[PDB]
């Protein structure tokens, strides 16, 4: 019931005939980058991070770069990591030991799997892999086992939530009362 076509919309119309050709040029650019970058992946190793926004906090997700604490714990430096093929993010901070240990083991696996060539010479041929993302996939952590013993205590979670709500709602009043005391 609301169609926004009172302006000169016919001037500003984009039709995506260029879809297929753009896909082809994107593939060709990836191939050319691969040739120019030959022994290396085309993708930097990214960390695992937990998403924000309660709708999405259940999921774990790939991030921008590893922290400096994670990098030092792994036992190499940020600059050498950036040369080796690792993304680093100076502004991400670590408040979760699970994520910390996960990304540390990620870096350990990467270090063990890679093969670095010396600066001076030899350069043995290595048969490039194109996807560190596929080589080191993101893993959703496992919350609990499939089956378990039931244990009931009789506090009825409904009432528990109601009491939490009530104390949140009536916090300030009781504090001001105890103040007036």
């Amino acid at each position: 019931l609301k169609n926004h076509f009172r302006k000169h919309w016919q001037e500003r119309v984009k039709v995506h005939f260029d879809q297929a050709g753009k896909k082809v040029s994107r593939r060709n650019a990836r191939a050319t980058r691969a040739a120019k970058i030959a022994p290396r992946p085309l993708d930097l190793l990214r960390p695992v991070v937990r998403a924000p926004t309660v709708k999405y906090n259940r999921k774990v997700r790939a991030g921008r770069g590893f922290t400096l604490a994670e990098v030092k714990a792994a036992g190499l430096t940020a600059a050498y990591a950036r040369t080796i093929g690792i993304a680093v993010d100076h502004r991400r901070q670590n408040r979760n030991q699970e994520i910390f240990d996960a990304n540390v083991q990620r870096l350990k696996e990467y270090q063990s799997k890679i093969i670095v060539f010396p600066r001076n010479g030899k350069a043995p041929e290595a048969e490039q892999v194109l996807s560190a993302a596929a080589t080191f996939p993101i893993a959703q952590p496992a919350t609990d086992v499939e089956a378990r013993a039931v244990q009931d205590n009789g506090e009825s979670a409904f009432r528990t939530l109601r009491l939490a709500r009530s104390e949140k709602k009536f916090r300030g009043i009781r504090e001001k009362r105890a103040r007036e005391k």
Binding site: K7, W9, R12, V13, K14, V15, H16, F17, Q19
Partner: protein, 203 residues
């Protein structure tokens, strides 16, 4: 260091020593021309932090700009349209006087590139700025990789296009929920979201 003392002292503008210096220097600048070459900065600390370096190819121009609002140059203040436009002496010129001064100075000195500018003084009638410029044909700046970027041709009339700090401010280019309509370009976002995207297989 003395630049720190200079900074903290130039912050104290309503003290006796600074209002004396102001009262003298404004008279000097008003007896001089509207645009004129300054042998050295009045404010070396400000110039130093804005990017001046006391060596060859760095130039300072003092410039004067008339104060007040914008008047639309229609004959006899008549606009010949709906009455809702406004009173005519109440228009504000989105670009700042600093930008006006930068652009006039760059028009006088077209071989130079405008690096920056800073307020020095003002009167009821006039405001006074010192503009820092660079010579990209000078070899000391074509070398010296910290300033060889100004010699590339995408930095022609930065002041006219709105790439100096006053230009970025007047365009409203910063990050946040406040600068949502003008973050990558006001007209860019307008053209982007007043645009009908239609794919091959219609969605």
């Amino acid at each position: 260091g003395a630049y720190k003392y200079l900074e903290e002292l130039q912050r104290k503008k309503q003290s006796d020593v600074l209002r004396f210096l102001q009262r003298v220097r404004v008279w000097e600048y008003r007896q001089k021309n509207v645009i004129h070459r300054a042998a050295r900065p009045t404010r070396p600390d400000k110039a130093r932090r804005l990017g001046y370096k006391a060596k060859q190819g760095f130039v300072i121009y003092r410039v004067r700009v008339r104060r007040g609002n914008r008047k639309r140059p229609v004959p006899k203040g008549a606009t010949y349209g709906k009455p809702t436009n406004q009173g005519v002496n109440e228009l504000k010129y989105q670009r700042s006087l600093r930008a006006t001064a930068e652009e006039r100075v760059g028009r006088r000195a077209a071989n130079l590139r405008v690096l920056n500018s800073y307020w020095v003084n003002q009167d009821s009638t006039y405001k006074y700025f010192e503009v820092i410029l660079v010579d990209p044909q000078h070899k000391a700046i074509r070398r010296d990789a910290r300033y060889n970027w100004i010699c590339d041709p995408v930095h022609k009339h930065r002041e006219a296009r709105g790439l100096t700090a006053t230009g970025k401010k007047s365009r409203g280019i910063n990050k946040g929920h406040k600068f949502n309509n003008t973050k990558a370009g006001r007209r860019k976002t307008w053209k982007r979201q007043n645009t009908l995207s239609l794919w091959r297989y219609r969605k």
